[PDB]
């Protein structure tokens, strides 16, 4: 079972590595050491693995001139960058990319000693959670809606009166389709082109037409023209952006800056990304792109100019709680949504929520995390077609046209890390054949030998300075012992001291971590091995408080030791950000906005966050961080006032 998955992975890497080809005798020793039976039983299990690898899209070439044969995959290369993914595989891969991104952020903040996202992380461009909630709520309650819409001819801003039939994703971008009562015909609206939040007309009713096909309506959509942007950027900055550059040269007058061109289709999408970069970029052209960036920066300046609301939070007993930090149960359930989403009849929300024993709204939030969170960097934009009608979500299968995707070594390795965490989730009663398994094998071929470290949550070697702590944690877990932990602060000038119940030791991105129930925080935390100052048994048995309580976050989602606590004001349009960042507390504000207290992983990410969201966010406290963000925005704005 597990030995077959691992055996396939090892076989695939051995054949990929050899440029000359390996004979059967060498493969037996390298991969099939486990098989205690001789050539007879191994020979057929080898033949079965060859057949099985071919079904994952790997053709084993035989070079010979019996037992005289040599085998290899990929001919002279040791990677296969091109894979064909089914919709199920692509959706799993989407969750994996989200896990990688959280791992990458933790490592960048933790290993910092002037903000800059790490390699393989780009700003997250996603449809607004609130607008999504409002369309979904409108359809559920059979209410028509109204919203500001910037016209197809980029003409006047215009309020549209719509009966919503469906939401849909094509080319990574989300659309609303519905009956436009002003035109008396159906119309498609790009969410990015809405000027307002959606007002749900809860006094009204409508029925959608029985003969309405959301997939056929959205399939008729034609991709936007690929336009060219001209950008001046600071040297040695904005790595994800430079990955997209079609040309590069020194900037005409500004020292230490480059002039690049990048291709984009939707200018609202590019402007949100570029606003997140603040003063590190200036749009020189085109003007529609430039005006969108300034608007976001300016709307962010103006919100910080607005007077401060009172910092009054309710007792949080009479309020609806924000999204909780994602747990292993939720991750496992989201994997189990995939077969519904790709089945020919799709995912019927009420019926599937009942089946999992959760509310309708809880199930919708699972889906928003999974498929409405945008595409991380290194995840391709032309992989998933999504339709979301009233109570009905389905990822359309384009028959016998698996979309080929190319991954670099780095992108495949990053994704394998997210897949290996998904692969380490608790085993259920019911393995083989799943989409998780198949996309893991395919991405392994795209990473080559780098898959061996990246595709594992346990094999990484241990630096000598960490070996002592690695052995003490290992033994404490095995013997059920509590540990007294002295943990370095980020700067390593101080230590916190605390009793912990060690639970799991695991590696990610060449880093060792241990999950432990911390008796000082009274919750599960995930610590970096290379930040342990010392660990000693304290003579007590593990308390077992981890299994007590309610659920706890999965390992990439626990609050970090280095988090900085920030109080935000959100507009109604941006109210969904309080869920994205698992707000500790919220307070509703008169016009549908809210106060939100959130933990950010690093104070350096905050100005990018605020400028990215272009007026839907402001920092209230602490004052130091608020002004430091206003300076980022002001420095960004002063590039254009000339
Ligand atoms: K090869």
Residue numbers in the entry: 1 to 65, 74 to 121, 132 to 448, 453 to 664
Authors' text:
During the mycobacterial DNA damage response, the heterodimeric transcriptional regulator PafBC activates most of the genes required for an adequate response to DNA stress. Based on sequence similarity, PafBC belongs to a family of bacterial regulators featuring a winged helix-turn-helix (HTH) domain at the N-terminus, followed by a C-terminal domain of unknown function named WYL domain after a consecutive W-Y-L sequence motif. PafBC activates its target genes via a promoter motif called RecA-NDp (RecA-independent promoter), which was demonstrated by in vivo identification of PafBC binding sites using cell culture cross-linking followed by immunoprecipitation of PafBC-DNA complexes. Mycobacteria and many other actinobacteria employ two distinct yet interconnected pathways in order to upregulate the expression of specific sets of genes required for repair and survival of DNA damage.
Three-dimensional crystals suitable for data collection were ultimately obtained using an A. aurescens PafBC construct (AauPafBCΔNC), which was shortened by 17 amino acids at the N-terminus and 7 amino acids at the C-terminus based on sequence alignment, since these residues are not conserved amongst the orthologs and not even present in most of them. The PafBC structure features six distinct domains, three in each of the homologous PafB and PafC modules. The structure reveals that the WYL domain exhibits an Sm-fold, commonly encountered in RNA-binding proteins, and is followed by an additional C-terminal extension (WCX) domain featuring a ferredoxin-like fold. Importantly, the putative recognition helix (H3) appears wedged into the protein core, and following H3, a long loop extends around the back of the central α-helix of PafB (α4) and the WYL-B domain. The PafBC WYL domains are located at the periphery of the molecule on opposite sides, while the WCX domains come together to form a dimeric interaction module.
